[PDB]
Amino acid sequence: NLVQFGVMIEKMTGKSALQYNDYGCYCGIGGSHWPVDQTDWCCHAHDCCYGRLEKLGCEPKLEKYLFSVSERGIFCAGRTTCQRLTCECDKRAALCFRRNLGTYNRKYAHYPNKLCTGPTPPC
Ligand SMILES: Cc1c(C(=O)C(N)=O)c2c(OCC(=O)O)cccc2n1Cc1cccc(Br)c1
Numbered sequence: 001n002l003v004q005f006g007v008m009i010e011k012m013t014g015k016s017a018l019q020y021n022d023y024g025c026y027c028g029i030g031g032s033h034w035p036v037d038q039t040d041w042c043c044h045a046h047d048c049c050y051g052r053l054e055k056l057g058c059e060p061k062l063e064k065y066l067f068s069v070s071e072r073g074i075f076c077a078g079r080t081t082c083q084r085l086t087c088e089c090d091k092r093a094a095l096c097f098r099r100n101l102g103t104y105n106r107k108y109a110h111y112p113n114k115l116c117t118g119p120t121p122p123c
């Protein structure tokens with residue numbers, strides 16, 4: 001369930017969430033090998049974030065959360081701790097995407113997975 005994350009991405013980046021789908025080697029389902037750039041690192045970190053949440057008993061692929069965006073930043077909320085954790089993982093990713101808007105390159109969008117090489121960096 002990707003609706004709330006995609007919304008958070010759009011608010012923070014000024015780009016459709018689709019622009020971060022299949023981006024590089026890590027943005028989109030799964031991921032492996034070496035991250036192509038800083039945006040892709042955000043996604044590697046985000047994958048790691050979700051792994052920690054699964055180990056905690058949460059299901060961050062599916063959790064539904066609440067959030068708002070003021071000038072103070074992104075406010076995360078939800079009924080359960082797992083929902084709030086999911087929002088936090090997503091928030092850090094959205095902020096990481098915004099922050100690295102400078103090096104976002106369109107060539108890495110829809111990256112052929114055959115072009116991903118190197119080792120897989122650990123969490
Ligand atoms: C940025 C991103 C993701 C990540 O943060 C990532 N680390 O791979 C992501 C994603 O990662 C979650 C995962 O692989 O556990 C799955 C599908 C689309 C994804 N996207 C693109 C996306 C995100 C939200 C809504 C839409 Br529509 C598209």
Ligand SMILES: [Ca+2]
Nearest residue numbers: 026028030031
């Ligand atoms: Ca991924």
